[PDB]
Design an enzyme around this catalytic site. Sequence first.
Site, mmCIF file in Angstrom:
data_model
loop_
_atom_site.group_PDB
_atom_site.id
_atom_site.type_symbol
_atom_site.label_atom_id
_atom_site.label_comp_id
_atom_site.label_asym_id
_atom_site.label_seq_id
_atom_site.Cartn_x
_atom_site.Cartn_y
_atom_site.Cartn_z
ATOM 1 N N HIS B 84 46.334 46.253 34.636
ATOM 2 C CA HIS B 84 46.898 45.723 34.008
ATOM 3 C C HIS B 84 47.891 45.632 32.658
ATOM 4 O O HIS B 84 47.696 45.681 31.937
ATOM 5 C CB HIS B 84 45.220 44.270 33.538
ATOM 6 N N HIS B 88 52.541 45.861 36.451
ATOM 7 C CA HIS B 88 52.048 44.145 36.433
ATOM 8 C C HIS B 88 52.780 42.947 35.491
ATOM 9 O O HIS B 88 52.651 42.198 36.946
ATOM 10 C CB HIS B 88 50.196 44.348 36.824
ATOM 11 N N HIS B 147 51.632 36.927 30.377
ATOM 12 C CA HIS B 147 50.335 36.527 31.018
ATOM 13 C C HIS B 147 49.005 37.344 31.317
ATOM 14 O O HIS B 147 47.899 37.138 31.296
ATOM 15 C CB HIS B 147 50.443 35.872 32.899
ATOM 16 N N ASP B 148 49.312 38.230 31.136
ATOM 17 C CA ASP B 148 48.183 39.730 30.946
ATOM 18 C C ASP B 148 48.580 40.042 29.451
ATOM 19 O O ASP B 148 47.372 41.822 29.598
ATOM 20 C CB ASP B 148 48.293 40.777 32.309
ATOM 21 N N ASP B 261 50.438 36.134 41.180
ATOM 22 C CA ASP B 261 49.768 37.247 40.270
ATOM 23 C C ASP B 261 48.733 38.305 41.213
ATOM 24 O O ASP B 261 48.738 38.788 41.118
ATOM 25 C CB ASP B 261 48.157 36.834 39.820
ATOM 26 N N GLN B 312 39.102 44.522 49.660
ATOM 27 C CA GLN B 312 40.187 44.324 50.822
ATOM 28 C C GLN B 312 40.014 43.502 51.135
ATOM 29 O O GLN B 312 40.515 41.824 51.306
ATOM 30 C CB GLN B 312 40.593 45.526 50.830
HETATM 31 C C1 XKG Z 1 45.915 41.633 44.054
HETATM 32 O O1 XKG Z 1 44.568 43.255 44.146
HETATM 33 C C2 XKG Z 1 43.628 42.649 43.716
HETATM 34 C C3 XKG Z 1 43.573 42.252 42.349
HETATM 35 C C4 XKG Z 1 42.890 40.899 41.335
HETATM 36 C C5 XKG Z 1 41.494 41.437 42.645
HETATM 37 C C6 XKG Z 1 41.223 42.075 43.128
HETATM 38 C C7 XKG Z 1 42.572 42.438 43.907
HETATM 39 O O2 XKG Z 1 42.105 43.276 44.904
HETATM 40 C C8 XKG Z 1 40.426 43.785 45.455
HETATM 41 C C9 XKG Z 1 40.117 40.973 41.419
HETATM 42 C C10 XKG Z 1 39.133 40.489 41.977
HETATM 43 C C11 XKG Z 1 37.944 39.523 41.413
HETATM 44 N N1 XKG Z 1 36.411 39.139 41.933
HETATM 45 C C12 XKG Z 1 36.242 39.075 42.846
HETATM 46 C C13 XKG Z 1 35.730 40.606 44.010
HETATM 47 C C14 XKG Z 1 35.785 41.466 43.102
HETATM 48 C C15 XKG Z 1 35.398 40.303 44.654
HETATM 49 C C16 XKG Z 1 35.622 39.163 45.689
HETATM 50 C C17 XKG Z 1 36.081 39.711 47.065
HETATM 51 C C18 XKG Z 1 36.393 38.242 45.486
HETATM 52 C C19 XKG Z 1 36.784 37.597 43.453
HETATM 53 C C20 XKG Z 1 36.800 37.086 43.413
HETATM 54 N N2 XKG Z 1 37.905 40.096 39.491
HETATM 55 C C21 XKG Z 1 36.739 39.129 38.750
HETATM 56 C C22 XKG Z 1 39.103 40.455 38.774
HETATM 57 O O3 XKG Z 1 39.494 40.582 38.103
HETATM 58 N N3 XKG Z 1 40.332 40.979 39.753
HETATM 59 C C23 XKG Z 1 41.305 41.001 39.333
HETATM 60 C C24 XKG Z 1 42.646 40.589 39.875
HETATM 61 MG MG MG Z 2 44.555 38.093 34.077
HETATM 62 MN MN MN Z 3 47.719 39.223 35.890
#
Ligand code: XKG
Ligand code: MG
Ligand code: MN
Lengths: 369, 363
Positions: B84, B88, B147-148, B261, B312
Amino acid sequence: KPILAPEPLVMDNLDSIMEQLNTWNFPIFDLVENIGRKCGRILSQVSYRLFEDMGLFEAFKIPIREFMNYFHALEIGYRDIPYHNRIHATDVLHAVWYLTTQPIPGLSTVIGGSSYVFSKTYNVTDDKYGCLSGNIPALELMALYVAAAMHDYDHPGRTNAFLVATSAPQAVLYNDRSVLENHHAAAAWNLFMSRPEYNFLINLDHVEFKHFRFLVIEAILATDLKKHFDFVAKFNGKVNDDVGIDWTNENDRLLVCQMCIKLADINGPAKCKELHLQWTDGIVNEFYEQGDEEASLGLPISPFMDRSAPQLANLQESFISHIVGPLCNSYDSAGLMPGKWVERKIYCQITQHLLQNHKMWKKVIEEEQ
Amino acid sequence: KPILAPEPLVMDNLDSIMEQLNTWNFPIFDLVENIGRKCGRILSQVSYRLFEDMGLFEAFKIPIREFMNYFHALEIGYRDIPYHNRIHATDVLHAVWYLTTQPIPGLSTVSYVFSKTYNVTDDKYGCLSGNIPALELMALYVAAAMHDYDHPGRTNAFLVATSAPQAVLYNDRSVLENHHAAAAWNLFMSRPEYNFLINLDHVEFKHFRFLVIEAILATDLKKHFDFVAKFNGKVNDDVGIDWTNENDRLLVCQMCIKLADINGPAKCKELHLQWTDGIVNEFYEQGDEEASLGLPISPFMDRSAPQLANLQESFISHIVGPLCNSYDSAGLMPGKWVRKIYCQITQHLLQNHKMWKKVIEEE
Ligand SMILES: COc1cc2c(cc1OC)-c1c/c(=N\c3c(C)cc(C)cc3C)n(C)c(=O)n1CC2
Ligand SMILES: [Mg+2]
Ligand SMILES: [Mn+2]
Ligand SMILES: COc1cc2c(cc1OC)-c1c/c(=N\c3c(C)cc(C)cc3C)n(C)c(=O)n1CC2
Ligand SMILES: [Mg+2]
Ligand SMILES: [Mn+2]
C-alpha cells in the site's frame, strides 16, 4: 487530568423529584434548579437512579465509582449551549428508560427468556400488559441506555449541514457522513478508554464488550435525522411486509432499539405543553445562533433559522407532521407505545400530547394569517 | 512549510516508459527503477501524463503547478511499506484510466473528454469516457490517486481488534478508507498552493468531493459483495445501465475503481507475482505484530506457515473472478473483435487462476 465523580457521589436531597422519574412528563427543569444550573451533575445522578432501578449494577458487577467517574466526565463534556446539553442527554436517557420499562398493552413476552432485567416500578402481574425490557436482553438494553447518555457528547450547537457547508474540520474528518453522530460516539468512546478510572464495564468479557460497543455505536448513529425516513421505512417494512418483530432475531431487536432512541431524541413535541415549549425555546435559540453565523459568513440563512423572520409555528407544525408524527405512527403500529386499556381501545398519553401540541400550533398559524 | 513539487515539474528521462502507459501490462516496476526507488515522484509524474493525455488541464483550467504540488504532497504521504505504497496508488490510477479510455467492443458512445490514444474511426468500439462526463471521470482519477493515502500496512480487522485510535475515531466503520479520504482532503484544503480545483464553481466542487469520497469508500472489501450484487442487479434488470442516470454512472465508476484496486491477478504472470510478494509481505508483518500481542495470527498471515497458493486461488475465486465476470457481463471490459471478442484481462485472470490451481494439486 482525570475528571472524577465529586465526593458526595450520590446526592441525597433530590429524592422527592427523583421519585417522579416513572412519569412521562418528568419535571426535568425543576430537577435542573434543584441541583443547580451548570452544577454539572444532572446526567450522572439520573443515570445512577435508572441503573439502580433496573438492577444493572448487580447484573453486570458494575463498580459504582467507575460508573460515576465516567458519567461525570461525560456530562462535563456536554457544552453549555441552549439545547444539545447534558439536560437533553438526561431527557433522552429518561425517555428510552420509560419506553422500555413501562406497560405496553397487549405486548407478548418472549418464549424461552432466562437474560433480562425489569424496573422496580414494574410490579403489575397482568398478562394484558408487557414491556420491552422483557423482550430485550439486559446487555442490549444497557447499550441503548449508555448510547442515550453519550449520543450528543461535545455537540457544538450547529447542524451537520452547517458543518458540511463550511468545511468544518469535523466534516472533513468524517467525509460529510453523519459528522456529529460519528463524533459523539467516537469522542465518548475515546473518553471511556482514556482512563481505567472510567472502566465500569470491567466485568464484561471481550466478546460481550465488543458486541456492546457495536450496539452503542449503531444506536448513536441512528440519531442522524438525514436517515430518519430510511429507518421509518425499514421498520414499517418489518411490520407490514414481514411477520412482525421477531424478538428472537438480533437485527429486529437492534431496529426496535434504534427506533426507540430516535423517538426519545425528539420526544419534546410529545410531552405536555410546558415541557414542549421549554425545549422549543432551547432548539430555536441554537437555530438563531447558527443563522447569525451563516449571515456573517455570507451564506444564505437556513430555513427557520432567521430571528428576523422566525416562522416558529410553521417549524413546529411541519416538524410534527413530517418527522415526529410518522415516527410515532410507525412505533404505535408495531404496538410498542406505552398506554392503558380503556375499561378493545387503548389510551395513549404520548400520541395524545402530540395531537394537542399539533392543534395548538395550527391555531397560531391561522391567527397569524 | 508546504511540500512543493520539484522545480522542473515534468521529468524528461522517463519518455521511453511513459509512452507505454496505453498497454494493460504497463511495466510499472521498470518505471520505479528509472525514476529511483524512494525518489517519491512516480505518482505525480504519471498523474501529469494521464491528465495531459485526457486534456483535463484545459477542460477545467487546472493550474499545473498547484496540481503537481498536491500530487507530490500526496505521494510523499504514502508510506514505504511493501504493498500500500505510492506505486500501488500509481498502478490503480493507471488501471482506472485504462478501463475508462481504451476501446470496448460494441459499447454505444454518447461535457466529455477522450484519450489522445483513442482513434474515433472505429464505430465498432466505444469507451467509458464517451459515456461518463469529464467531471465524474476526473473525480474517479483523483480518487484512485488518493485512495490508500497514509496506509499503515494493516487491515481494518486488525485496527478494530486492537482498538487502534483510527478504529475508535471512525467507530469501526471503513476505518482506513474513511482515513484515506479524510486525510487526503485535509491535505488538499491545508494549503492554497494545492488548490488545483480553483476554477470549479461551488456546485461542481461539492459534487466532485462527494464523487471522490464515494469512489474511495467503495474500495472497502467488506462491501465487495454488496457492490457486485447491486451492479449485477442493474445489468440483469430492464433497460440495463442508463448512461443518462447519475446513480448508474456512479456504480460503474465504483466497479471500475474496485477492479483497478485488485487488478494484480488480472495482469501478466510477472507483474502479478511481483504484487503478490508485496501483499504477502504486509500480511506477514501484521502476523508478526498479532503474535507480539496475544492475538491469533490471521489466515494467510503466518510466515512460519504459509498458504500462498490457497490465498491466491481463493482470492481469485471468491473476490476477483466474480467482479471481472460481473464487469464483463455488463460489456465494459476492454477487448478486441477477432463475432468473437479477445479480452486480455479475463484471459490473464484465467491463466493466473490455472497456475495457482496446478500449484495446489502438486501438493
Ligand atoms: C491483488 O492482491 C491482493 C490484494 C489484497 C488482498 C489480497 C490480494 O491477493 C492475495 C486482500 C485480501 C483480504 N482478505 C481476504 C483474504 C486474506 C483471503 C481471501 C480468500 C479473501 C479476502 C477478502 N484483506 C482483508 C485485505 O486487506 N487485502 C488487501 C488487498
Ligand atoms: Mg485500501
Ligand atoms: Mn488500494
Ligand atoms: C424537539 O424539538 C426539535 C428538535 C430538533 C429539531 C427540531 C425540533 O423542533 C422543531 C431539528 C430539526 C432539523 N431540521 C429540520 C427543520 C429545521 C425543520 C423541519 C420541518 C424538519 C427538519 C428535519 N435539524 C437539522 C436538527 O438538527 N434538529 C435538532 C433536533
Ligand atoms: Mg444529535
Ligand atoms: Mn439528541
